[PDB]
From Swiss-Prot:
Induction: During mitosis. The mRNA encoding this protein contains an internal ribosome entry site (IRES) in its 5'-UTR. This 5'-UTR generally suppresses translation while specifically promoting expression during mitosis, when cap-dependent translation may be impaired. Coiled coil: none annotated. It comes from the Eukaryota. May be required for DNA interstrand cross-link repair. Also required for checkpoint mediated cell cycle arrest in early prophase in response to mitotic spindle poisons. Possesses beta-lactamase activity, catalyzing the hydrolysis of penicillin G and nitrocefin. Exhibits no activity towards other beta-lactam antibiotic classes including cephalosporins (cefotaxime) and carbapenems (imipenem). Expressed in brain, heart, kidney, liver, pancreas, placenta and skeletal muscle. This is DNA cross-link repair 1A protein.
Amino acid sequence: TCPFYKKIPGTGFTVDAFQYGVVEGCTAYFLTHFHSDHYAGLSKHFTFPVYCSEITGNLLKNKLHVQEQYIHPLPLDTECIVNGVKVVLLDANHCPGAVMILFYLPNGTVILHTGDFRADPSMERSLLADQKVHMLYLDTTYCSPEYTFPSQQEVIRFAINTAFEAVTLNPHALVVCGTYSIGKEKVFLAIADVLGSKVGMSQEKYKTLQCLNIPEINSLITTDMCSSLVHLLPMMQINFKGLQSHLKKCGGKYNQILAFRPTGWTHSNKFTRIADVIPQTKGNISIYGIPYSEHSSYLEMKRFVQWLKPQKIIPTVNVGTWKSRSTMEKYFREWKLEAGY
Ligand code: NI
């Protein structure tokens, strides 16, 4: 049954609540972003209103074949009325088309649902700064101080440099980049741009990336694998067997693979700097796991909340164990006491 943390009080609304069937008393279903754990449930047979970003609307229509009469895309940064309630959608700094939702209840309560996000100081100058927020439904994915990671920019620099050096040393080396959902597109686009290649990929993937409004996209991606020296594969294939296989398929065009796995966090982060990252190598194949995160670090989360000063915090990730809940409530209380709200 739909859990409490996916329900918005004083409304007919739910958030990311498509896998419970008809939810008693839900008049509109909000979808923060196109990741499977959040859209699980949607298909062509859905006949309730769905509210979401334009990009999320492109993917619903094209990938899951939702009928257009049921997709209600909204512009970001704009006050809109849905079943008599004022709402705004804000950039969540997550994957393309990912949003946070502000709800302005009739009674004067204000609710912010972050959906999934990576907190940034740039958010401190959106429409959030203009009024008080009473309740916050918080993406707590990395709510613990062991979770530190580098900026997205330093990680991309590491990857551009690594790849440019490899292929310049050996122009017969192929670069591979794993994917299994939208997001983290900058990894493979920035590598391809420094190497003066297009990124080649399967048709289903090319379809997906065409839904995202990325500027100059036709210039950067292709389904012609042959003309490309940066290839995207499913994450599951990013291993020595999967990569020997793919190298066989390229017909003596290449003699070396350099491959990249964007992971969220890996415990090498507590000890190791981004400068210091090394690959796993077998023969003529090397695999780099790089810490490219689209969720908040513990410090970026703490700073956001301390800035926002919510009256109540409702965690939406890691809720399923008592030891996790308890740990999180401790940190919420720490942050409050430290900042004085
Ligand atoms: Ni997500």
